[PDB]
RNA sequence: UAAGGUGAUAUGAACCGUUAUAACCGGCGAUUUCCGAAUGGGGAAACCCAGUGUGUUUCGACACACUAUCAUUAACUGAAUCCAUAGGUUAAUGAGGCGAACCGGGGGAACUGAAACAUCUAAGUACCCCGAGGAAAAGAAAUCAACCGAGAUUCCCCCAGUAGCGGCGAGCGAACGGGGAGCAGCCCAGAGCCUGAAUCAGUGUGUGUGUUAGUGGAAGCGUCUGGAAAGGCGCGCGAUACAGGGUGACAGCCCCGUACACAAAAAUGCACAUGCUGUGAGCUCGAUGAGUAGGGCGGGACACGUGGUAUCCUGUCUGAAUAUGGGGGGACCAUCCUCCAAGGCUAAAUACUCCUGACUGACCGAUAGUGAACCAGUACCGUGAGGGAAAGGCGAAAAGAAC
RNA sequence: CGAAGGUGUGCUGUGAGGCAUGCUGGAGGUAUCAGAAGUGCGAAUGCUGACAUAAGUAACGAUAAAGCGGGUGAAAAGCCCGCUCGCCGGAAGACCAAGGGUUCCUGUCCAACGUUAAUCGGGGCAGGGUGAGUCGACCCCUAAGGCGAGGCCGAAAGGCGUAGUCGAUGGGAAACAGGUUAAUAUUCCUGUACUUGGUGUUACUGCGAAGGGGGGACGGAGAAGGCUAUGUUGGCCGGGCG
RNA sequence: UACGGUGCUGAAGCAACAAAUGCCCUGCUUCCAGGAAAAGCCUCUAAGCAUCAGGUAACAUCAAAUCGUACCCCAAACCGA
């Protein structure tokens, strides 16, 4: 019963990247997702001789609260909320708006 | 693997158990050296043995 | 007569160190880490079976664990049993 | 322990009251006595540490009885 | 100057050790007390 | 129940897993080193040393079980001593130890007050000991009452700071009676008839209802400030859900939830329903608890300090009647009333919280609140019993500052 | 479009106080009228923390004593190497017990610790290191003493104590010399030994204890005599001729 | 020659004297204050067993487990903050 999953395309409700869109890369146990291209930070990576890392200002993706994102309904062209229902003895997610199953 | 191993005799089971243990030992020997570059194997095998042990206890007096 | 399972569980590891290397090269003596509960005869039996090599004798000793300090917190390392196993003349071990 | 075996009389605490009513804790010991009792049925003497009152009881009832009660109580004699 | 504490392991154990505490009632109560408190080292025993 | 996982400081490595034996959660199992009642003997706890038997051996040794004490019962055996008994060896069953408070019993202070102090008080308190239960204890009138009557025990409010007690000081302090909570009565002292009649406990089965994982669970957009909107300003919608928490500032409609509606393969509590095992109900005839009641001496308990002191208990010495009898009605006698001691059992209303869950607070908010918001009964101190701290906050996010 | 808190300013009330506002601060505050209090601190040789003073003052822990050259280093009175000097030598040397518990050795670092500096350290971090039939414990035996089946005694708790069982500081089998590690050695290696158990043997033939006996098994002081450890001298061997 | 050391090599290796508080000595002499215990060890038999076991005899083989072993130890490591 987790509304947002690894490979869902989502849209951001809040923050500096609000309105933007992206595929979820992975979701954390802490209640945070990392989405592709959305929340970017320019970490100063410390060089290390071992592991073949040179060291520089790497721009990587920082996590974002799940609440802050929303699963995008391609049909409506908008963010929607997710509900759960049993179809053929199997739980499936659906868009509250327009009531269509997520596939 | 428990369901597969359940369909066996006692003598069989004992042999595999021994075979698991010998492996374990080999891995331990490798691990101490710089040979073993697959650590999960140790974990696996230990679990495998415990499973067998369980299957022996179930068979004999349960 | 020692049970095979027990034998397998005896031997923890080879011990690498300068002294150990010297013992290997000169006196034909291997230095093993073994179970703390493992007695000498047991160790010998296990050597013979699992490395397939004749044993002259086993000396053992108990290594006490060092007290260390991780940050502010004190903590002690485990004690463990060392075994010098002298192997019969002409016995070459892999 | 100073206990009549027939009656169960133990020591009990109490006071010495002086003429000036100065209470001081005291005991009251029973009048115990170890006595051989002839048991006519079994034909042997049974020793019993027992109070004069216990004696009187025995006399009244019969030693055999007393022994039975005691047995019931789970006491050795 | 000979100071009061002149350690001796055996003497320590006999006096204050676990088994000594176990032997008598009062010692057992002490042990129980210490357990209740949450003492890590229940006794002098190393 | 699942698309994410392999606890944490704490990353990484090597890996697993994605529609179902990955991981996670719950039931029932398995394993469960050593010390510890510790129980084969010993011991400076976490160690030392056995015995016996059954099996195996590559014959060097392995394995695994049993071996405490006491009580009780049974079997065999068995002295002085003829029989016996004591004793002895086996076997079975139970116990042992730990644990907050509450409960019953065995013992039992002093400081203090009395403006000193001894009776008295503090107080049957503190404490020590034994025993038990989820509660315990008590309990079915040899009770009150007053010539009317009540009808076992327990607890609450009155009666009443009254009557009393009291170096008549300091202080202690009822009862009768009334209002409530809750209410239940039974058996043996013994034999006849009838024979399985109510009730209780253990134990299976069935039903209901919990508990131990869970499932679904409404409705919002635009714009301005701003690092960020949940804020402002607009216009909407849900509400058996505006409890609460989180989300980059304050969110009913972003998330988790909440109301509401559903859920258990398995285990299990409590109700009834039912089978089995033990138990005996109703009827007639009786019988009706002796070193006991009373008494003397000494103590103690009763609000009651021996006093004019009834009543209860008994260390000591005595010692009835036994229903045509006996107990009590606060010295004692007479009359009347009232009850039936010297054998037992018994739910409820009552007491407490080590512990579990839920919810609440004109309670604290880091010198407070637990000693302890933090790896605290730790560090440290002490031979030991024992004592016993300090120490919370970057940021929304490490983006924790490459060069 | 900036809350509390902090810090200035201005105004204001008879006072405790109040109002406004600049900066800081970055999220809470709260009128009014009522309500309740852990409601107001300068003192209690009050408590807890912080920071002063004396003061850069006293002191730097035996009056056994240092000097130089070279090295390393960011830096050398203090570290390493060298040569002198000085101190102990029935100890200030060597080996153990007890007690400690890694302080041992190697590499590395110098914040803190070291009464200064520190490249050094018994400091930090990492790694390494303790080898036994004959040493010791364990083990057999017991002393003082402890526990103590039954038992005797005791309100309870418990006390004493028999049989027993524990208890060394005492009794009881066996190893020496050399060599070796950075760090262990009667433990490793080299050589040369010993012990007491089993098991199997052939040979023989009275074995057998919870019992009997012997032994173990024992004081102080004194006196010598015989010895060795050890030392001195000579001889010998090697080197030397200042 | 990594200036730490490593490998090879190696003469003589006798005598006298002196000499312990150490050994013979758990002895001897003496004194009164009159000087552990038990086992190991030797030996004697009893119940027993009886031509078996057990004993001693050499010889062969196996065995000796476990724990401690670093370092300080009149001290900078123990008792004294």
Curated annotation (Swiss-Prot), chain B:
This protein's source sits in the domain of life called Bacteria
For this UniProt record, give its keywords in alphabetical order, as a comma-separated list.
Ribonucleoprotein, Ribosomal protein
The answer to whether UniProt assigns keyword NADP to this entry is no
Species of origin reads Escherichia coli O157:H7
One GO biological process term is: translation
The record's listing under PANTHER family reads: 60S RIBOSOMAL PROTEIN L35/50S RIBOSOMAL PROTEIN L29, LARGE RIBOSOMAL SUBUNIT PROTEIN UL29C
* InterPro entries registered for this protein in UniProt: Ribosomal_protein_uL29 (IPR050063), Ribosomal_uL29 (IPR001854), Ribosomal_uL29_CS (IPR018254), Ribosomal_uL29_sf (IPR036049)
Keyword Repressor in record: no
One Pfam family per UniProt: Ribosomal_L29
- What function is annotated for this protein? One of the proteins that surrounds the polypeptide exit tunnel on the outside of the subunit.
Recorded GO molecular functions are: structural constituent of ribosome
Name the gene behind this protein: rpmC
GO CC terms in record: cytosolic large ribosomal subunit
What is the designated name of this protein?
Large ribosomal subunit protein uL29
Q: Which family does it belong to?
A: Belongs to the universal ribosomal protein uL29 family.
Swiss-Prot record, chain E:
Task: Give a yes or no for keyword Cell membrane in this entry.
Answer: no
| This protein's GO CC annotations | ribonucleoprotein complex; ribosome
Show the InterPro entries listed in the entry. Answer: Ribosomal_bL34, Ribosomal_bL34_CS
A Gene Ontology molecular function term for this protein is:
structural constituent of ribosome
Is Transit peptide set as a keyword in this record? no
One Pfam short name? Ribosomal_L34
Q: What processes in GO biological process is this protein linked to? A: translation
**Which keywords appear in this protein's UniProt record, sorted alphabetically?**
Ribonucleoprotein, Ribosomal protein
Please give the family membership noted in the entry. Belongs to the bacterial ribosomal protein bL34 family.
Which HAMAP family does this one have?
A: Ribosomal_bL34 (MF_00391)
Name of the molecule in the record: Large ribosomal subunit protein bL34
